[PDB]
Amino acid sequence: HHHHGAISLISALVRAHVDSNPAMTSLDYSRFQANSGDDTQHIQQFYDLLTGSMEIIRGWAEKIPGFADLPKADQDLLFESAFLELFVLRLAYRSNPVEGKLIFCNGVVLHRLQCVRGFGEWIDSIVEFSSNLQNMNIDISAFSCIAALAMVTERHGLKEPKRVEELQNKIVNTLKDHVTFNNGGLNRPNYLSKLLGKLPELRTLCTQGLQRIFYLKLEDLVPPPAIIDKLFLDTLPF
Amino acid sequence: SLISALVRAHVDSNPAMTSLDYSRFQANPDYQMSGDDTQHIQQFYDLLTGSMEIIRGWAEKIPGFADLPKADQDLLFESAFLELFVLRLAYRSNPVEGKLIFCNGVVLHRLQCVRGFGEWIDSIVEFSSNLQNMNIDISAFSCIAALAMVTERHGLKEPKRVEELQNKIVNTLKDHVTFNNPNYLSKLLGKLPELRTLCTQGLQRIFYLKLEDLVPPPAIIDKLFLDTLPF
Ligand SMILES: *SCCNC(=O)COc1ccc(Cl)c(Cl)c1
Numbered sequence: 001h002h003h004h005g006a007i008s009l010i011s012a013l014v015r016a017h018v019d020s021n022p023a024m025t026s027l028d029y030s031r032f033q034a035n036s037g038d039d040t041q042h043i044q045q046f047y048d049l050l051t052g053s054m055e056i057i058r059g060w061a062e063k064i065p066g067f068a069d070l071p072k073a074d075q076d077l078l079f080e081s082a083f084l085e086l087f088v089l090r091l092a093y094r095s096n097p098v099e100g101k102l103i104f105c106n107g108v109v110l111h112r113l114q115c116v117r118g119f120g121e122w123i124d125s126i127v128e129f130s131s132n133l134q135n136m137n138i139d140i141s142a143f144s145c146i147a148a149l150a151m152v153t154e155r156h157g158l159k160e161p162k163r164v165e166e167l168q169n170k171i172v173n174t175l176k177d178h179v180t181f182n183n184g185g186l187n188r189p190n191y192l193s194k195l196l197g198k199l200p201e202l203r204t205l206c207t208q209g210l211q212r213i214f215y216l217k218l219e220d221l222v223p224p225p226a227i228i229d230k231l232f233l234d235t236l237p238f
Numbered sequence: 239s240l241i242s243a244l245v246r247a248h249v250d251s252n253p254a255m256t257s258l259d260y261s262r263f264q265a266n267p268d269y270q271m272s273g274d275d276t277q278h279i280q281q282f283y284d285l286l287t288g289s290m291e292i293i294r295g296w297a298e299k300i301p302g303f304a305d306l307p308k309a310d311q312d313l314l315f316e317s318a319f320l321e322l323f324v325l326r327l328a329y330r331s332n333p334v335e336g337k338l339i340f341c342n343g344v345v346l347h348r349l350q351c352v353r354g355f356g357e358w359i360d361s362i363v364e365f366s367s368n369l370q371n372m373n374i375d376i377s378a379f380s381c382i383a384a385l386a387m388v389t390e391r392h393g394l395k396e397p398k399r400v401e402e403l404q405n406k407i408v409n410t411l412k413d414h415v416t417f418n419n420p421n422y423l424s425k426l427l428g429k430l431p432e433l434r435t436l437c438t439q440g441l442q443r444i445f446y447l448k449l450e451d452l453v454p455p456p457a458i459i460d461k462l463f464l465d466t467l468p469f
């Protein structure tokens with residue numbers, strides 16, 4: 001059986017994920033090197049990879065059912081306080097952690113060693129989380145709800161926290177329906193609990209990214225673009 | 239009498255070297271990294287806020303500071319507090335014995351400090367040994383501490399009254415080095431840039447604790463953290 005609206009919801013969530021992801025069949029290995037340059041170039045690349053995904057991740061956000069119906073202030077805070085979380089999660093799902101290949105949403109493929117000078121040791125945690133994520137063998141339907149749950153959660157400063165809460169419960173309900181239906185009606189309480197357990201791991205992982213942005217901002221070798229600053233200020237807690 | 243006024247302002251806002259407080263001190267490493275993280279983070283905040291009342295009284299006892307517009311007095315204080323907190327701690331402490339001595343006389347071992355201060359305390363101790371190897375007398379330190387707060391800022395109301403106060407302090411410092419000591423003044427005044435870099439390590443630590451949200455900073459620490467972020 002299925003919740004009412006569960007099939008149409010999870011279908012729209014899968015379409016949102018597929019439409020906002022890079023063509024694996026036609027990716028870009030132009031700068032890929034398995035085994036350097038100045039610091040300013042690597043930091044600028046770090047900023048540029050973050051910025052380029054912002055517009056794509058918000059396009060994915062606008063294709064979640066009911067997300068557009070929220071107030072714009074709620075849409076902005078939800079998207080902003082979840083951007084790095086979505087950036088990390090979608091990068092960890094997309095990448096090849098065994099080969100150290102980081103695959104970004106514009107299709108650019110870079111090796112883990114090519115990213116350490118921009119990302120810092122934060123790239124080592126992203127690779128580790130990617131292996132753990134991929135070891136769970138999460139299909140696209142279950143991933144698409146987990147991705148939407150990373151954004152549709154409670155945040156301080158929401159104007160109408162119910163529609164968020166009401167949308168979040170519907171996403172949880174259709175993730176449960178899928179896990180049960182896919183397994184032939186047999187519930188999987190372990191896979192689900194481990195699946196939802198990846199959201200706090202992702203939140204912890206994206207504080208490491210905020211510390212990296214704060215570090216680069218204070219040392220002031222390459223100032224962040226204005227939109228990285230706005231991302232930083234609008235999401236500082238309390 | 240200006241440098242004597244700065245020396246007395248330092249002496250009055252600092253614990254008498256014989257009235258040290260070992261009530262919290264612990265030499266045994268088994269007990270130096272004990273207890274929950276909450277009381278360790280809270281003690282970290284409490285030492286920071288406990289130094290605000292002390293450094294503020296030290297600033298008011300600097301000749302001419304109180305004669306500035308208080309909007310400038312607050313901008314000067316609230317933008318050098320962490321630098322002053324670290325500089326006075328590094329000058330007060332016993333880095334070779336691993337003893338950090340705070341402005342209330344409380345003595346804590348370095349290993350008692352890592353749970354709250356984090357990695358930051360190692361860099362503080364390193365800076366503390368480098369500072370004391372210069373054997374800066376109390377007269378030159380009182381000038382240097384004042385110069386950490388009486389300096390260039392964006393948004394002051396009479397910035398050249400601060401500058402004229404600043405250069406009065408610089409001139410008497412140079413007069414002191416002349417009478418008493420290529421000189422250590424170049425590396426001494428260079429310790430203020432190195433202090434600033436050490437201060438931004440402290441902001442990283444407070445930023446981390448804010449993100450962890452185990453014990454959120456008090457409003458006063460949160461305000462001054464937010465007020466020194468470069469946008
Ligand atoms: S880095 C320049 C030194 N002084 C300051 O930053 C202002 O004093 C502060 C700064 C940050 C925090 Cl959290 C406090 Cl409590 C005081």
Ligand SMILES: [Cl-]
Binds near residue numbers: 020021022056
């Ligand atoms: Cl796309």
Ligand SMILES: [Cl-]
Binds near residue numbers: 021
């Ligand atoms: Cl995919």
Ligand SMILES: [Cl-]
Binds near residue numbers: 096101
């Ligand atoms: Cl691959």
Ligand SMILES: [Cl-]
Binds near residue numbers: 149
């Ligand atoms: Cl949830």
Ligand SMILES: [Cl-]
Binds near residue numbers: 007141177178181
């Ligand atoms: Cl389904």
Ligand SMILES: [Cl-]
């Ligand atoms: Cl559940």
Ligand SMILES: [Cl-]
Binds near residue numbers: 385408427
């Ligand atoms: Cl100077």
